[PDB]
């Protein structure tokens, strides 16, 4: 709400006032930063050493091993330190491959490209926002609806949500054993194509991480100097954070963002890059408080945009950028909501690199509040409320409906 | 319009695409920047030398000398190089001093402070946005209305607008001999108070100066490399520039922003700082294209905010920051719409430092289009449409009306 009432042109003054308060509460902000920096440097060295050894620094598990409860305590600790995980064989390869063809048909038959070109204005900006598109405002294809409700996928999301410390001061901040569905888009990157994608960033808020008292509570051990107590997997306070209202706001708390692979994923073939450092955010928060940063500036952090990590202000973090592991169709990869990530710039592969966005979102009040309005958009075939009201699929042939839904899918979408 | 249709979360991709195009059109962007840099360095050295000699680098003229047409060609050239001018004795000191008392009474009697506190939410942000205020959402006091329509002030604005090259390719881009009124606020800075004010900045657009083809036309000689042909006082294209819709947008083209002093102004007493380099913008535009700037970044330029010049990206420009000359009540100071400026941080003076915002806005179609809707707000006592709809003075005792207006004031406000 406080964020909801702050004008976009009052932000620089907001930042100036709040930065003074944080430097005053944490007078040794420099020494704390240097201590945090050393902890980060040690994670970076280890990641670079993994890469140099030919090991991918992103942890990998088999869905079967999750389902059968064979994941060891050391593996869970590794995932929590790296803040990410690739999970293989969630779906059979045959199914995912068919899913890929089906989404393609779905787009082909309903003339998506032609519709996108029409929905764009004659601006330079509009027009190849509407040609060679890579992210598709497509939400209700049967493969998306089937993928979200699958039992294996549910077990994997429950596993991941249980990595969090969900209980604090007598209160359950979310139910890790209960999954709700967050409908999202699908991406299809052609070989040899350029990238529109954002540079290394984190979704879920930018300036607000400093300006909002609720975000600052999530990060209380960072701003008080007790950085060793900061825990990225502590749930407390995260479903309560306030964001500047914008198209970048997600209505749901997601513990992990996720990709489900519809095609093989390879390095240098349009795959995902991450910085696998779960507590990188502490470095970023503290970085913006140093003396070499202007008073009304937070290292470029800006309204209505994902928080960016740059070579300019965070060259240490950039040293730890890594491609995700190779994936086959039916594999997945997940990353903590605070993990820095980025689509790689170039795709020199032979075929389209295609994925569905499918996150892990646990049951909680915040997330429960979004379900009814999301359900309405599903019922209508409209774009969900967190997205541009393109509403492409209202009249699409073969759009998925309530009748494609299992009982799991029904409960995850808030149909009782 | 193109700017009007660009989403706030599509900007980083917009910047990435446009920066590639500009570096490709200007492949020697580095060498051009270094040549521009040298030209700037020479203006900075001269300004610092002025300051070291105890001369203020902001040109000064007497209103009488303007009115009697005694300003020399060298003085006009100096104003055009420095991009600013202090103009003394526009109003008699006695009048301006009374004006100051009258605005004070006007605020006192109508309980402005108490009203502001009520119009603010119970946020940390809201509350001393509403106490110890420095900028007052006050538009229609009789001193403001009288000051805007004064004959001496009109002559001074016509003088300044005639400094511009108003004619190009058969077309008059604005009528320098015809003034229209732009109603604005009033500022009152108490001694020993902190500053909310923005760091060194330029109003009238930020990212759009690179992203909008119309802005890029104003700056065509910069982006083509022919920087020596760039002329800050060329009118062509400026009334056609497109801005990202925000509370920072001014509906009128102003050739100069301006302050009218209601109290004495002194250095270290809450006065104005400027960087008196009219073509500083060329350095700023080119700076953002260098190899040390990230692909989707324009040295911090951001939507809905004045363009900032920083120690971080423009330390050369910061070396040339200067206080405006000392002013008495009734004096004025004006600066080119592209001139970097900034309220000084500290006020160690003995009394309130108070000014009225009164710009120079020439007649042209763009400006003529705003007059009717501005007139409506004047008629109602509402906040003008470019400002927050506070509407404080609707029921204020002593608000100015159409009956306070001379025939000049009537014509400047679009009453035939």
Automatic annotation (TrEMBL), chains A, B:
2-oxoglutarate binds at residues 187, 257, 357. Pfam families: Gig2-like. Mg(2+) binds at residues 201, 203, 341. Keywords: Metal-binding. GO terms for molecular function: metal ion binding. Mn(2+) binds at residues 201, 203, 341. The keyword Cell wall biogenesis/degradation does not apply. This is DUF1479 domain-containing protein. It comes from Yersinia pestis.
